[PDB]
Design an enzyme around this catalytic site. Structure first.
Site, PDB file in Angstrom:
ATOM      1  N   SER A 123      39.448   9.326 -13.375  1.00 50.86           N
ATOM      2  CA  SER A 123      39.663   9.631 -14.635  1.00 50.86           C
ATOM      3  C   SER A 123      40.835  10.726 -14.972  1.00 50.86           C
ATOM      4  CB  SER A 123      38.451  10.327 -15.400  1.00 50.86           C
ATOM      5  OG  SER A 123      37.446  10.086 -14.490  1.00 50.86           O
ATOM      6  N   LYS A 175      41.112   5.314 -15.536  1.00 55.04           N
ATOM      7  CA  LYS A 175      40.598   5.753 -16.809  1.00 55.04           C
ATOM      8  C   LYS A 175      41.312   6.628 -17.542  1.00 55.04           C
ATOM      9  CE  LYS A 175      35.978   8.145 -17.054  1.00 55.04           C
ATOM     10  NZ  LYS A 175      34.957   8.307 -17.865  1.00 55.04           N
ATOM     11  N   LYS A 180      42.109   9.342 -20.609  1.00 55.48           N
ATOM     12  CA  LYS A 180      41.739  10.002 -21.788  1.00 55.48           C
ATOM     13  C   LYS A 180      42.598   9.734 -22.939  1.00 55.48           C
ATOM     14  CE  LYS A 180      41.562  14.381 -20.907  1.00 55.48           C
ATOM     15  NZ  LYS A 180      42.206  15.476 -21.292  1.00 55.48           N
ATOM     16  N   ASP A 221      38.679   6.805 -22.053  1.00 58.18           N
ATOM     17  CA  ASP A 221      37.732   7.421 -22.611  1.00 58.18           C
ATOM     18  C   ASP A 221      38.027   8.108 -23.626  1.00 58.18           C
ATOM     19  OD1 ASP A 221      35.658   9.437 -22.987  1.00 58.18           O
ATOM     20  OD2 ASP A 221      35.872  10.596 -21.042  1.00 58.18           O
ATOM     21  N   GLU A 236      35.093   3.802 -23.721  1.00 59.80           N
ATOM     22  CA  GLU A 236      33.986   4.500 -23.397  1.00 59.80           C
ATOM     23  C   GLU A 236      33.836   5.816 -24.522  1.00 59.80           C
ATOM     24  OE1 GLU A 236      32.153   7.676 -19.977  1.00 59.80           O
ATOM     25  OE2 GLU A 236      34.044   6.850 -19.608  1.00 59.80           O
ATOM     26  N   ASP A 269      27.817   6.395 -22.888  1.00 63.85           N
ATOM     27  CA  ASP A 269      27.530   7.314 -21.914  1.00 63.85           C
ATOM     28  C   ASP A 269      26.505   8.420 -22.401  1.00 63.85           C
ATOM     29  OD1 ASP A 269      27.630  10.033 -20.607  1.00 63.85           O
ATOM     30  OD2 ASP A 269      29.981  10.077 -20.506  1.00 63.85           O
ATOM     31  N   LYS A 287      24.706   8.228 -15.774  1.00 62.89           N
ATOM     32  CA  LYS A 287      24.557   9.267 -15.055  1.00 62.89           C
ATOM     33  C   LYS A 287      23.261   9.937 -14.628  1.00 62.89           C
ATOM     34  CE  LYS A 287      28.814  11.110 -17.325  1.00 62.89           C
ATOM     35  NZ  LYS A 287      29.761  12.031 -18.078  1.00 62.89           N
ATOM     36  N   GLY A 323      30.315  10.772 -13.391  1.00 59.99           N
ATOM     37  CA  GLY A 323      30.529  11.874 -12.599  1.00 59.99           C
ATOM     38  C   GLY A 323      30.570  13.028 -13.411  1.00 59.99           C
TER      39      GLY A 323
END
Lengths: 360, 360
Positions: free
Chosen positions: B127, B153, B155, B180, B205, B230, B254, B282
């Site tokens: 990410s 990924k 941001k 994300d 996400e 998430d 998670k 993570g």
């Protein structure tokens, strides 16, 4: 004009009940006045997820440093300063509600007035625990009806629900009767809960999971008695979702659970826009929290009675100078600026477990 | 057979980043072996609602007293013994996950094996943060593509979203690419997010509120790119509600967020039953948390790459003896019983800031 928050105190009292209850207080100082609020989190996460250790660490380590020495236009600006952080609504509420009390006192105006309420007294209900049998239930209801309470709430649980409700409704055909189902039921219990329908309860409170709306919406399709949400409505957007999904038709509004007065008014207003009532829930508050609740309860969509009954039912001696005593099911709004109540600091000192002061 | 938990240590490390991150560890002792787990709550409630102060107080004052000196058949029995306290899933997970490690080590069996996994390696992605411009994004993506990471990924935020995605996709037409959206949008932003559809992202996400499902379900109707949840899936029942609502088509699983390995397996299985994949999120873990994540990720519905990249990406030195390094986007399962990793106690001591032991 604007107010600078110059100092804060955190005082944790161990207040004798009528066994003790831990009462966390926040006092904010500025502009020659003070605002006080009471935390509704417990030592362990039983009613909801927050705890005293978590909340007080968040206050001293994050929220108070963010506001001390700063100048604000209104309590909304105080809240806004803490918006980065997630959840922890009751910790947030301590700050936000103390800020409302402080702000109101800088203006010399009652808190309920600033929130838009104009009631001088608020209707109160009573909450009954589980009794041993039907007749004991009816006897206790009869007592409280004679005392003038305007709503009766019976705690129920699997195996003990239709029986106390039936017995009560037979004895009291016309009273406002409700039950607290205490998240003790499942969707498999729909048939049993449907047997309550013929007794015309005003609502059943949070029968399924504490954090659920979706399954409550299904249950509401299966029974005719209205559902009332409690733990599952922690914001105005939660209230919208609950009402739009059909999860319930009534909300038990607890001011600290939703993050304070401004968000509570928003919940109140969202509910009103759906033509759904709110009522003021209780959390065994000292006179500080009880007075906050009474002021909030002056708003017009608090159309069912609240759990703001007499302080003397809970406490040998309360932490404030003013008695909060309901008469004939009506609790007067305590007079004065802000909450209209005042700490009794000498008595508070005798029951203080810990205290601390913070400045910028 | 059954295992008795005889002692527990809480060790909090302040681990230098390659400025620091706090690593709360729980070590459970019994039957001549130990289980270790890592808390994923932060000092302040930034990613979600729990905090280190709240969690550790819940451990020492509630959860550890409930289990110390007691004998259990399995980790599920340990979870059952913690009681009906609400929320606090990451605090619960410290106990539950340490119990899995301990239990597995009494049997001499790898943890993933007991959870039903049979992969020897797991696919991993990375990410990337917001970069200064389109070219800087492409350059950084190229570095990671040239390491063989199997998903990138990015941001994104308003109004830096279409631009980095477009530039990346043009340079890399065939890579697995995701974003994300960091809860940085509301329903007001649907049209902009729809512009991402032409770039064939695997998912977006958690674009809306961290605790929402209902609005995500509305957004999913308006754009073709799948949504990945998430923060709003903290249990198997949340996963069911999300997937039945159509709030997302993918879940970032998670392990600590949902309360540990058993609940994670349940979330994994609920997702699979709806035809939705999971992938392993993570939380910038030390090697303890990373090893737990790798073992869980061996289950069959972990069908998209996990955020589980090399420890040397994060730390100049890890808290465990063994390396956890991925090559060509594949992370090997660390060999040995339980998590297959071992605390480096001498090094851990140099970065310990708090340590306590509890017995019955």
């Amino acid at each position: 004009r604007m107010f600078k928050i110059e100092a804060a105190e955190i005082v944790v009292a161990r207040l004798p009940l009528k066994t003790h209850k831990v009462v966390p207080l926040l006092i904010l100082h500025g502009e020659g006045v003070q605002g006080v609020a009471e935390g509704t989190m417990e030592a362990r996460p039983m009613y909801r997820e927050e705890t005293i250790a978590g909340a007080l660490d968040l206050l001293r380590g994050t929220f108070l440093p963010a506001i001390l020495g700063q100048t604000f236009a209104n309590p909304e600006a105080v809240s806004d300063a803490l918006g980065s952080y997630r959840g922890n609504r009751m910790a947030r509420a301590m700050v936000e509600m103390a800020a409302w009390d402080l702000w109101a006192r800088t203006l010399g105006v009652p808190l309920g007035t600033l929130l838009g309420g104009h009631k001088e007294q608020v209707e109160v209900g009573v909450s009954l625990g589980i009794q041993a049998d039907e007749q004991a239930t009816v006897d206790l209801v009869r007592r409280h009806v004679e005392q003038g309470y305007r709503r009766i709430k019976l705690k129920i649980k699997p195996g003990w629900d239709v029986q106390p409700v039936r017995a009560t409704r037979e004895a009291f055909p016309d009273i406002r009767l409700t039950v607290d189902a205490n998240s003790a039921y499942t969707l498999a219990d729909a048939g049993r809960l449907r047997q309550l329908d013929e007794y015309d309860l005003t609502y059943i409170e949070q029968p399924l999971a504490w954090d659920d709306l979706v399954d409550h919406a299904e249950l509401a399709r299966r029974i005719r008695t209205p559902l009332c949400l409690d733990e599952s409505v922690a914001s105005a957007s939660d209230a919208r979702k609950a009402l739009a999904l059909g999860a319930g038709g009534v909300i038990n509004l607890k001011v600290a659970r939703v993050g304070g007065h401004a968000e509570s008014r928003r919940v109140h207003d969202v509910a009103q826009s759906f033509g759904a009532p709110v009522w003021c829930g209780g959390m065994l508050e000292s006179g500080i929290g009880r007075a906050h609740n009474i002021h909030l309860s002056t708003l017009s969509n608090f159309r069912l009675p609240g759990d703001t009954s007499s302080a003397s039912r809970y406490w040998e001696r309360d932490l404030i100078q003013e008695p909060l005593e309901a008469v004939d099911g009506l609790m007067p709004v305590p007079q004065g600026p802000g909450t209209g109540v005042t700490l009794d600091r000498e008595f508070l000192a005798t029951v203080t477990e810990a205290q601390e002061e913070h400045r910028a």
